[PDB]
Design a protein around this ligand. Structure first.
Ligand SMILES: O=P(O)(O)OC[C@@H]1O[C@@H](O)[C@H](O)[C@H](O)[C@H]1O
Lengths: 590, 32
């Protein structure tokens, strides 16, 4: 089997980890016949692949022919789990025959590529090199075995049709991840999911300069023996856009890091949450007037996309929840984190000041408690009891009093833990100001914006992304245009409830495999057949419902959501790949 | 076909002409 992908040497997308995790199961299935094809990169040979100068034990002549004919190729082992047998093909080794190749490419699949797009030319030459390698291999393989070709990415798939143009007896599988033109559709201020039946595809690809990319994407999809797509909604949009119904859906699987004990994922949540509290205390010095044992932590993560990630709907849902909580007379208060990496400079002076004040209060408490420990030790040694008539000392009260005096503050706490480069055009802050969330004492919803990836090297919040995710109570991911969705899957594996939509690939996948997806904590929405107001009202209702449960009910919900990690593991998702490969083999040669 | 060289060389990408996608469909379908 041959895996063809452009993300073997560079980590530009999530395909890298998907392939790395799938390599173990694919190798276990295919023995020593598992080969992977990828481009050669100067930056991806140092600590990314162990180059094997020795010839392949089952393949010696083709490498010699390829090297003698001018092109340069390398064999080796990918520095990932399992046993990978990877080949790296240089992009400049055969850069001297682009004109001849495109001259003989006119009659094959009739694709044209602009001369100023280096990436498209590199993909085209990669496809030519791959089809040449397959031709050489089958010529030198004595035609004894049968070769199956699997393609994961559209740049790497351009050569697939080339194989179909050479009458090569191989099984052709085309797998796509997302539509490139669909990404630009969502920014056109035109409804996309409710108009899926009518696309003027040719022109919208034309004037937007993405015509040829979609052209060979659709050519590869049509020419392939079998076509696969990541999720159900992505399959539907491919059918209504590429005019070809995918044979089967191929959701992405993720390896799960099991623990010795089932409940350990709870303990990792217990301590990590504490690390959050020490932060929020520091961010709320002089305004800590609410019980912190009755506080809920919500968060939304991922790339800084406003409409495509559902930040706005989450914001007005939280505003509605705040309005509702001020009429029910409840004491529950929620804190919402926005891990939205944006462009920022420096830190916020007030936030660091709050951290320093918290540390100073801790130091004062430590000194007073050490003095109390000394006095109590002496009294216990003499054989008495502390009557608290000497712990006053008439001196520690002075320092504690001036500490409390210093803690006093008049201005409101800030909403950002950084300093925005621009503030008149930042959507998040404009929406927050518009809806009226200023972290006031009378409010019941707090907003914390941290436009930076969480890392242990940061001065404030000394935790990475994984620990912070494990510390929260419920992740809200109201995705709008999300092909598959990795963050909700990661949260589900970690063992926390999540809120998703059927529009997202993960939500659609979960909705069609488990009945009644409400008792397991995966709160599904409906942004496809409902208006924005209905969706936000349903989200507010879900948020209130989550706020309604007790601690025991939350423990039940998290425990039940933990058991769903086995569903997303590759051990279960490999069945779809097996079915697709078997169907391709049957279609090619019985 | 010669007049179709430059149209896909520097990126004209004609779409209301006689070079639509179906013009590639009805000759690629013969490949299988
Ligand atoms: O999940 P919570 O509602 O925040 O409960 C708080 C903590 O949750 C889990 O870590 C454990 O059950 C702890 O025993 C409990 O103290």
């Amino acid at each position: 089997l041959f895996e063809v992908a452009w993300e073997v040497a560079n980590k530009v997308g999530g395909i890298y980890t998907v392939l790395q995790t799938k390599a173990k199961v694919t190798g276990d299935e295919w023995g020593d016949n598992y080969f992977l094809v990828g481009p050669y990169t100067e930056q991806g040979v140092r600590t990314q692949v162990e180059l094997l100068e020795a010839p392949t034990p089952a393949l010696k002549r083709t490498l010699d022919s390829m090297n003698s004919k001018g092109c340069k190729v390398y064999f080796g082992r990918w520095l990932i789990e399992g046993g990978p047998l990877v080949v790296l093909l240089d992009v400049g080794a055969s850069a001297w025959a682009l004109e001849r190749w495109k001259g003989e490419l006119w009659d094959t699949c009739n694709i044209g590529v602009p001369w100023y797009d280096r990436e498209a030319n590199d993909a085209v030459l990669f496809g030519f090199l791959t089809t040449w390698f397959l031709g050489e291999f089958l010529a030198q393989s004595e035609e004894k075995p049968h070769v199956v070709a699997h393609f994961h990415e559209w740049l790497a798939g351009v050569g697939l049709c080339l194989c179909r143009a050479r009458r090569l007896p191989v099984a052709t599988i085309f797998t796509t991840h997302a539509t490139l033109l669909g990404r630009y559709l969502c920014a056109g201020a035109v409804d996309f999911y409710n108009n899926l039946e009518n696309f003027n595809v040719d022109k919208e690809a034309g004037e937007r300069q993405i015509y040829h990319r979609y052209c060979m994407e659709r050519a590869a999809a049509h020419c392939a023996h079998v076509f696969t797509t990541v999720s159900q909604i992505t399959a539907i949009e491919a059918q209504h856009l590429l005019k070809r119904k995918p044979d089967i859906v191929t959701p992405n699987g993720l390896n799960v890091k099991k623990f010795s004990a089932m409940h350990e994922f709870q303990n990792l949540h217990a301590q990590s949450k504490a690390r959050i509290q020490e932060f929020v205390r520091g961010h709320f010095y002089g305004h800590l007037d609410f019980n912190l044992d009755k506080t809920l932590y919500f968060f939304i993560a991922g790339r800084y996309e406003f409409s495509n990630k559902g930040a706005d709907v989450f914001l007005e849902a939280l505003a509605r929840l705040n309005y509702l909580l001020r009429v029910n007379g409840s004491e529950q208060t929620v804190v919402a984190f926005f891990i939205m990496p944006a462009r920022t400079n420096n830190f916020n002076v007030e936030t660091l000041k709050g951290q320093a004040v918290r540390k100073q209060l801790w130091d004062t408490a430590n000194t007073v408690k050490e003095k109390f420990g000394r006095k109590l030790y002496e009294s216990l040694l003499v054989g008495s009891l502390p009557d608290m008539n000497k712990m006053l000392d008439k001196e520690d009260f002075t320092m504690m009093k001036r500490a409390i005096f210093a803690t006093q503050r008049q201005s409101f706490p800030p909403v950002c833990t950084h300093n925005m480069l621009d503030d008149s055009s930042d959507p998040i802050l404009t929406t927050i100001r518009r809806i009226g969330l200023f972290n006031s004492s009378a409010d019941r919803v707090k907003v914390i914006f941290h436009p930076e990836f969480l890392s242990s090297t940061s001065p404030l919040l000394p935790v990475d992304y994984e620990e912070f995710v494990r510390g929260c109570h419920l992740g809200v991911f109201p995705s709008y245009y999300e092909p598959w969705g990795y963050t909700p899957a990661e949260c589900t594996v970690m063992g926390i409830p999540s809120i998703s939509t059927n529009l997202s690939g993960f939500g659609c996948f979960m909705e069609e495999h488990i009945a009644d997806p409400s008792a397991y904590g995966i709160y599904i929405l409906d942004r496809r057949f409902r208006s924005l107001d209905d969706s936000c009202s349903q989200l507010t209702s879900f948020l209130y419902s989550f706020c309604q449960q007790s601690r025991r009910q939350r423990i039940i919900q998290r425990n039940r959501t933990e058991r769903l990690s086995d569903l997303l593991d590759w051990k279960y998702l490999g069945r779809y790949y097996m079915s697709a490969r078997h169907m391709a083999l049957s279609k090619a040669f019985p | 076909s010669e007049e179709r060289k430059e149209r896909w060389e520097q990126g004209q990408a004609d779409y209301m002409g006689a070079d639509s996608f179906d013009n590639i469909k009805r000759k690629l379908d013969t490949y299988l």
